[PDB]
Design a protein around this ligand. Structure first.
Ligand SMILES: Cc1cc(C(=O)NC(C)C)ccc1N
Ligand SMILES: Cc1cc(C(=O)NC(C)C)ccc1N
Ligand SMILES: Cc1cc(C(=O)NC(C)C)ccc1N
Lengths: 300, 237
């Protein structure tokens, strides 16, 4: 069980650590988060009480280094940093724990939610989508645009998701214009899975990371990517059975966790109605269709 | 964006453009079977691809053999239309290729956009105009060549005859759309109007009769009366 200490909390902020959040008051004696489960990526996340605009945060994996948060009064945000002195870090953490100045990652034993939301998400792939090679952790915020969004403006601050475009030369074979557009199986299985992602685990990891960026930061371009990756599968007549079964589980937990009052800005009516009711896979997502119909029947 | 009344003169500027109408591509007769079920029998169709500035009509005849053994024909017909339009643009010298293709029905947008992905500079546009090009098969010479075809064929026509020697392309398109709207609203009456006077003939190399300028004004008035008179009796005015 690992720890992310905070130097201090000088500005009032709502701090998130995966699906959980807590409020910290201006200059409250908060010194970090302990008991973070090892084995998963995690995201710490912030929203200034004064500026609910620009929610931002950091994806990290405590197996890759010792990380802490420190507020920067010049750039006006909580920054993640790596501590290279292991003994200084262990000493910092042990003192803050002795003084009980840390919140505990509040995992219920029964609860597999975070695992289910991050099953295929790996730090190494996160760091290829979010390019800042000098750090072991990755910053994301509400306003960052995607490579594909930039094609329709600072490349260093971009989300390099795999570009998916159903009316492209990559998606369509010459002489199969109709076949490939109406049944996207060759684009899914040959172009994307065999060619680009290499396996379905990497595809699902990017889909899961896009969703989490969309849900945690409202990154519009992340939301576009999540829906595009769902639609590419649902619009393919030929999908391995194990991928359909896993997608149904992936989406079930995403819909379950999705906060109710942001449903209208996180779920695209057209994609979900098409996927659940018109597509080739309309009858292959039983768990997801059941939760959607019982939680968000308005959208449908 | 979309083509409508506000940007109508754009049709007659010097940027090459084509209208594509797919409403006569897949044509059937519906009939009873011996068991008393219903079946369709396809008949030959055509793509109507028209340059509104020059009158040049690329009439690709769709022979019923293209439907043999295929499913979901009404869907396939849109993709076949887009395939043939793409083939036509690729058969034209670069300086004759259109800068825009306007489709008369929005269901043609995605099929045409997929065949012409590699041409990113040709705009594929819809229209809010309700153009009467479906009535093209009421032009006797066009219907004749379509019905006689025994194989796929492209036939080239000028749908304005020699009108452009005397009138502008705006006026020619307006006459064409008036004639076609009339033929669409009441084909028998429209055809009576056009052929009532036996002394006015259709040249071998033309589609429409050889009306003098004054006779065209009379004809156009007759046709405007057919349309408005049929519109006022239908919408209670
Ligand atoms: C549908 C469609 C596909 C291609 C295509 O994949 N081209 C690659 C060989 C570069 C080209 C044109 C076109 N109209
Ligand atoms: C799940 C979660 C979401 C938000 C949130 O504002 N999401 C919007 C960007 C759509 C905030 C905290 C939190 N724990
Ligand atoms: C106003 C508005 C906002 C969003 C939006 O930011 N969505 C992100 C949470 C993915 C989406 C749709 C919409 N109509």
């Amino acid at each position: 069980m690992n720890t992310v200490p905070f130097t201090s909390a000088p500005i009032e902020v709502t701090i998130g650590i995966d699906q959980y959040s807590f409020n910290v008051k201006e200059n409250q004696p908060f010194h970090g988060i302990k008991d973070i489960p090892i084995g998963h990526v995690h995201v710490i996340h912030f929203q200034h009480a004064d500026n609910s605009s620009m929610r931002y945060g950091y994806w990290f994996d405590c197996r890759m280094g010792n990380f802490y948060i420190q507020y920067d009064p010049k750039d006006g945000l909580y920054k993640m940093m790596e501590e290279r002195d292991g003994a200084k870090f262990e000493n910092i953490v042990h003192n803050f724990k002795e003084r009980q100045m840390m919140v505990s990652y509040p995992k219920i034993d029964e609860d597999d939610t975070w695992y289910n939301l991050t099953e295929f998400v790996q730090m190494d792939k996160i760091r290829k989508i979010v390019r800042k090679d000098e750090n072991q952790f990755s910053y994301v915020d509400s306003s960052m645009t995607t490579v594909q969004e930039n094609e329709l403006s600072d490349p260093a601050h971009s989300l390099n998701y795999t570009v998916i475009n159903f009316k492209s030369r990559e998606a369509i074979r010459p002489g199969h214009e109709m076949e490939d557009f109406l049944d996207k199986s060759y684009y899914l299985n040959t172009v994307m899975l065999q060619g680009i992602f290499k396996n379905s685990s990497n595809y699902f990891g990017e889909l899961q990371f896009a969703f989490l960026n969309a849900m945690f930061f409202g990154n519009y371009g992340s939301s576009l990517q999540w829906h595009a990756m769902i639609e590419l599968i649902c619009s393919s007549a030929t999908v391995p059975k194990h991928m359909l079964d896993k997608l149904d589980e992936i989406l079930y937990y995403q819909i379950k966790t999705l906060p109710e009052q942001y449903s209208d800005i996180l779920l695209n009516e057209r994609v979900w109605n098409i996927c659940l009711y018109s597509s080739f896979q309309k009858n292959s997502l039983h768990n997801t269709e059941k939760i959607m119909e019982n939680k968000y029947p308005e959208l449908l | 964006g979309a083509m409508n009344s506000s940007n109508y003169a754009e049709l007659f500027n010097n940027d090459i453009k084509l209208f594509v109408d797919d409403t006569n591509v897949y044509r059937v007769t519906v009939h009873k079977t011996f068991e008393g079920n219903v079946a369709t029998k396809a008949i030959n169709g055509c793509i109507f691809t028209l340059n509104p500035k020059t009158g040049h009509l690329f009439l690709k005849i769709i022979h019923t053999s293209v439907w043999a053994g295929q499913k979901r024909l009404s869907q396939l017909a849109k993709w076949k239309t887009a395939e043939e339009v793409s083939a036509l643009v690729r058969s034209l010298p670069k300086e004759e290729q259109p800068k825009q293709i306007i489709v008369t029905r929005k269901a043609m947008l995605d099929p045409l956009e997929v065949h012409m992905l590699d041409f990113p500079n040709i705009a594929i546009r819809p229209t809010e105009l309700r153009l009467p090009f479906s009535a093209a098969m009421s032009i006797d010479k066009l219907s004749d060549v379509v019905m006689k075809a025994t194989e796929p064929q492209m036939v080239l026509f000028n749908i304005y005859d020699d009108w452009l020697d005397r009138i502008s392309s705006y006026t020619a398109f307006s006459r064409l759309t008036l004639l076609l709207r009339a033929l669409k609203t009441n084909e028998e009456s429209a055809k009576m109007i056009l052929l009532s006077d036996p002394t006015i003939t259709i040249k071998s190399y033309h589609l429409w009769p050889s009306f003098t300028d004054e006779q065209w004004i009379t004809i156009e008035s007759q046709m405007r009366d057919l349309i408005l008179t049929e519109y006022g009796r239908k919408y209670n005015v």
